[PDB]
Amino acid sequence: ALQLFKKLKEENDEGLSAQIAFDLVSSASQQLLEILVTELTAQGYDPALLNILSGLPTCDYYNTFLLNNKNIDIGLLN
Amino acid sequence: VIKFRAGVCEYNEDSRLCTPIPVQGEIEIKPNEEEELGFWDFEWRPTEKPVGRELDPISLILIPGETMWVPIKSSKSGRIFALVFSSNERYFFWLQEKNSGNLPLNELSAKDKEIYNKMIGVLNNSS
Amino acid sequence: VDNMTRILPQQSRYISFIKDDRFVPVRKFKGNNGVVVLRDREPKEPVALIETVRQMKD
Amino acid sequence: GRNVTIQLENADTGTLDTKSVVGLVMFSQFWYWFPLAHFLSLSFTPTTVIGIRGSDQAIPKFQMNCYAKEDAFSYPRMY
Numbered sequence: 001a002l003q004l005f006k007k008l009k010e011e012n013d014e015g016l017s018a019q020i021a022f023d024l025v026s027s028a029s030q031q032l033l034e035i036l037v038t039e040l041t042a043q044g045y046d047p048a049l050l051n052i053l054s055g056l057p058t059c060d061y062y063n064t065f066l067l068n069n070k071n072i073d074i075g076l077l078n
Numbered sequence: 079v080i081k082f083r084a085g086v087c088e089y090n091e092d093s094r095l096c097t098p099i100p101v102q103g104e105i106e107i108k109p110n111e112e113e114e115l116g117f118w119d120f121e122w123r124p125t126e127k128p129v130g131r132e133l134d135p136i137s138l139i140l141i142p143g144e145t146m147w148v149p150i151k152s153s154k155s156g157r158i159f160a161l162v163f164s165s166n167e168r169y170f171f172w173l174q175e176k177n178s179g180n181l182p183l184n185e186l187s188a189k190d191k192e193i194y195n196k197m198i199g200v201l202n203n204s205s
Numbered sequence: 206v207d208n209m210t211r212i213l214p215q216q217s218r219y220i221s222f223i224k225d226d227r228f229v230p231v232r233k234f235k236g237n238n239g240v241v242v243l244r245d246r247e248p249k250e251p252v253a254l255i256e257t258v259r260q261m262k263d
Numbered sequence: 264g265r266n267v268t269i270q271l272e273n274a275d276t277g278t279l280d281t282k283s284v285v286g287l288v289m290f291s292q293f294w295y296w297f298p299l300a301h302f303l304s305l306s307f308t309p310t311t312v313i314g315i316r317g318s319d320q321a322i323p324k325f326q327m328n329c330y331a332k333e334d335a336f337s338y339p340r341m342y
Contacts, residue, residue: 015231015242015244015317015318016231016232018242018317019230019231019241019317022240022242022315023235023239023276026239026275026280027275027276029281057257057320060257060258061240061257061313062309062313063258064209064257064258065209065313066264066309068209069210069264069266070264071264071266071341072264073265073342074341075342178256178260179263206326206327206329206331207326208312208314208322208323208326208327209312210311211265211266211311212310212311212312213336214310215336216329216331219330219331220312220327220328221328223327227323228325231317235275238311238312239275239312240315241312241314243317243323245316245318245319248319252323252324253324254321254322254324255322255324256321256322257321257322
């Protein structure tokens with residue numbers, strides 16, 4: 001997983017790195033993400049990668065969708 | 079007492095550099111009552127992120143109308159709380175009022191209407 | 206169909222982004238629901254934007 | 264708000280999603296201790312294409328062509 005990121009370091013294209021990562025976090029083990037963040041820290045990799053892999057960015061995007069488009073049945077409460 | 083997030087920003091008049099030096103902390107205006115001039119103290123103190131220009135806790139007197147509130151005194155960056163003592167107590171300050179994050183915005187904060195009023199209130203009124 | 210709405214998977218299969226439109230994804234669309242990263246052709250053009258919730262709360 | 268569905272697995276890479284699996288098993292056994300009902304929340308995943316600007320992190324409003332019968336896939340009534 002690590003090696004894959006090293007190639008994209010060289011490109012310096014933020015868009016591509018992000019798109020790969022977002023798919024990886026969904027699938028990947030709770031364990032897998034945790035050791036990978038350490039490794040990337042020690043390379044000197046941009047902190048922007050580390051943040052997505054902590055998974056809080058995706059939590060926020062998915063939270064936004066829910067708030068705006070929520071259609072509440074009022075009948076449930078009654 | 080009237081608290082808000084603000085940081086220090088270097089004052090300048092040679093070239094008008096006036097770039098913020100980041101910090102976080104808070105600015106605290108105390109209404110006082112000292113004399114009819116008000117002397118509402120603009121205290122600047124780091125409550126947080128002391129990194130950047132330390133600006134050790136110090137309270138500054140206010141002489142009303144001599145201060146010139148001008149939003150983009152630098153004319154290079156937003157959120158320039160400018161207090162112009164005719165270079166005697168002239169310090170510049172940079173808002174970080176979390177509302178769209180720290181980011182400098184022209185014509186002060188993201189809550190445009192509010193901070194314009196706040197600014198008239200402190201400078202003009204004297205206790 | 207506006208971005209950031211509920212979309213059933215069946216509808217999603219048949220979606221193709223306008224290529225003239227600024228937003229076209231960096232690499233090809235998943236073909237199905239989930240977070241898809243767009244290339245912004247011009248940031249300079251003003252777009253009505255919905256800040257991520259984190260920022261709204263700060 | 265009628266916008267969530269339970270994903271069996273990340274069929275994208277064809278390996279079992281961790282969250283849905285655990286969720287379902289803890290929910291399913293509830294006869295003994297009634298509060299075990301709440302574990303089903305954890306399997307929910309919203310279905311929504313969310314565009315991301317890959318360098319500012321903000322959602323642009325824009326519209327895509329969708330070959331669809333809009334009426335068919337439009338939201339059901341308010342229950």
